[PDB]
Design a protein around this nucleic acid. Structure first.
Ligand code: ZN
Ligand code: ZN
Length: 53
DNA sequence: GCCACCGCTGGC
DNA sequence: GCCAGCGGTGGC
């Protein structure tokens, strides 16, 4: 994909950490869904926006 | 130029 | 129809 190399540790992760800013924003963690980004541990190390890592 | 949103839509 | 999560952008 555009933002996924599909081959790094972050790309292979299936579980959200539940503690980063992005996770806390999620409805599944009680957040408002205002940021709308993947867990920081799941941000592709090669392809993601530098500030998402 | 950056970042905290928010519009949008492919995939289900 | 919902929703994960990407791309664009207003306001700084
Ligand atoms: Zn997280
Ligand atoms: Zn990757």
């Amino acid at each position: 994909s555009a933002r996924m190399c599909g081959e790094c540790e972050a790309c292979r992760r299936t579980e959200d950490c539940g503690h980063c800013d992005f996770c806390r924003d999620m409805k599944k963690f009680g957040g408002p869904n205002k940021i709308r980004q993947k867990c920081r541990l799941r941000q592709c190390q090669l392809r993601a926006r530098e500030s998402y890592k």
